[PDB]
């Protein structure tokens, strides 16, 4: 029988207002070597972003940001015209790539077709300040201040050493002098250049002193997060992915304190399920839709300004897979982001679960939407327990449910939202939308194990 849980929505318990550009994706800077990829002509990839949000952020960076070399006279290799750069697996040095004005021209048209804003990595790992100044100037010239949210001066500088980019002795003090040199050079060329940093996992030895030192030089703090890894570790399972992650709660609390001490908001500029490109059997499954949807709400409730799920190529954890030549598809994780896209923006509300200790991985979020209608995003992340949710605190003549479903937690396909798969170019409409049982003040919703649901009340 289902676990019988109570959900109390409290319209007077005001949480954070979710911004309209909360959602986003992160890609490898190597992908900019292919001017066909981030292009006005990539109508397929553009459709997938527009469906994730009318407003959102495209972040370009990753380990490949230390291996990409902007040049004003560069042209793409014939290999570059066909490159699909998936997530760097973080074993060896990435391949050297060149970025061309043509690729930056085409990125502008892509941002025009998607309506999204840009976070743009610069090569602090291996490049020169003067070349970063020049690439920033061209990007400002072509993208504009309105669409360009921030430059980032290196990716995971705290990992440079492990990755062979700097010697073992490289520390925050060394990165701060590097950061200051790039910053100064870029500002000579681009006086209004916006920045974010330090573009790594929260920690005490890099992210906290970054904020204190560079607080007058940045728009916001940029953090990374992987739930799991390494992928060779048999610990890293769907079971563990469905559980609360105490490292995440701590880093989130670290970010809120930085915001208190410096006034700087925080965005999770690079995140996914499992690091080193993801884990087959975990990252590429329906479980990843429950994890991603849940994370978006959890970080929104904590006061995050937004999120950027890393992906590209056919990476195990990519929300969107494919190429201009072969087309694009929505991986399971995409469906978690689609639930958030359909909820829309508004102000988070109090939503308390009781009688739920035998279904402890059920999470719930209530939202007063910008259109005034109440919504509830539920993730039944229990792999073995069905739930029956008695919903109080909502007075409404009628609620509907869109279900986030696959026949098994580990399915790599068979993922639907609202009784429908995503189609070509991000096309989606609900084909199954049932009413929630009960009346004003007492709704009852069933959810099978390992399912999700979005409730919308009139
Ligand atoms: O999957 C991973 O480990 C990522 C970690 N951050 C940098 C990168 O995005 O390039 C990836 O290597």
Residue numbers in the entry: 18 to 475
Authors' account:
Notably, 3-GDIs are a new class of iminosugar glycoside hydrolase inhibitor, that have been shown to inhibit both GH2 and GH79 β-glucuronidases.
To examine the structural basis for inhibition by our panel of synthetic gluco- and galacto-configured iminosugars, we determined cocrystal structures of the 3-GDIs and either HPSE or AcGH79. Crystal structures with 8 and 9 bound to AcGH79 show that both of these inhibitors are situated in the same binding pocket as that of the galacturonic-noeuromycin 4. Within the iminosugar ring, there is very little conformational change between 8 and 9, and both maintain the 4C1 ring conformation seen for 4. Furthermore, the axial 4-OH present in 8 forms the same H-bond interactions with the protein backbone (with the carbonyl of Asp105) as seen for 4; however, it also has an additional H-bond to an active site water, see Figure 4. The axial 3-OH is also within 3.0 Å of the εN of His327 in both structures; however, it is unlikely that there is a genuine 3ax-HO···H-εN H-bond interaction as the 3ax-OH is oriented approximately 80° to the plane of the histidine–rather than being in line with the plane, as would be expected. Furthermore, the εN of His327 forms an H-bond, at the appropriate angle, with Glu45. The galacto-configured 3-GDI 8—the breakdown product observed in the active site of HPSE—inhibited AcGH79 (Ki = 5.8 ± 0.5 μM) more potently than did EcGusB (Ki = 137 ± 3 μM). Synthesis of 3-GDIs and their 3-hydroxy counterparts allowed us to dissect the mechanism of their inhibition both kinetically and structurally. These 3-GDIs are well accommodated within the active site pocket and form an additional H-bond interaction with the catalytic nucleophile.
